[PDB]
Design a protein around this ligand. Sequence first.
Ligand SMILES: Nc1nc2c(ncn2[C@@H]2O[C@H](COP(=O)(O)OP(=O)(O)O)[C@@H](O)[C@H]2O)c(=O)[nH]1
Ligand SMILES: [Mg+2]
Length: 161
Amino acid sequence: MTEYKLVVVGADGVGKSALTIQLIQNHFVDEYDPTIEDSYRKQVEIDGETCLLDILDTAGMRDQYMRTGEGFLCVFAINNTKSFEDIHHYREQIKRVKDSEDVPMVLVGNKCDLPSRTVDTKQAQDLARSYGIPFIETSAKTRQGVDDAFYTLVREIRKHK
Ligand SMILES: Nc1nc2c(ncn2[C@@H]2O[C@H](COP(=O)(O)OP(=O)(O)O)[C@@H](O)[C@H]2O)c(=O)[nH]1
Ligand SMILES: [Mg+2]
C-alpha cells in the first residue's frame, strides 16, 4: 500500500476543512475550528491501486508536509474573490518549497453549490492553464468534485514520479 502525502492550502474559510472531512467521514461539517491543523489518513482505491492518503489540512508541523508532501490542493471559494486573488501566494509558496514549477497541484473552486459566483469558471481555468495544472469545481456540502479533486491530485503525483 502506497502513501500519498497530500497538502490542502488556501485562504481561511474556503472549505479546506470541509473538503477534507467530507472525504474522510463522508459528511459536511458546517463549523470546524478555523485554527485546527492536522493530518487525516484514508484507505482509497484509485485506478485499481489501494492508496493511503495522508492529508494535511493547513490552518496555521506544516514544514514537513510542505517539504515532504507530494501533491498540493490549491483551494479558493467561487464566492470569494479575495481567496482567488490569494492563490498566487500559495502557488509561489509551494514552488519556493520544492524549488520547481513542476509540483503536482490542483486548483480547487469550492462552494460551487452556492449561486452568484464572483469567480467565473473561466477565470479559474485561465489561471490553472497558466500554471499548467488542473482546475476542478467542488462542493463539500454536496460531495461535488470532491473525490475528483483528491484523485486527480494522486494521478498528478503518479504522472510526476
Ligand atoms: N455551502 C457550502 N459551504 C461550505 C462549503 N465548504 C465549506 N463551507 C462552509 O464554509 C465555512 C468555512 O469552511 P472551513 O472548512 O471551516 O474552512 P477552512 O478555513 O478553509 O478550513 C464553514 O461554514 C463551512 O461549512 C461548500 O462546499 N459549500
Ligand atoms: Mg480549516
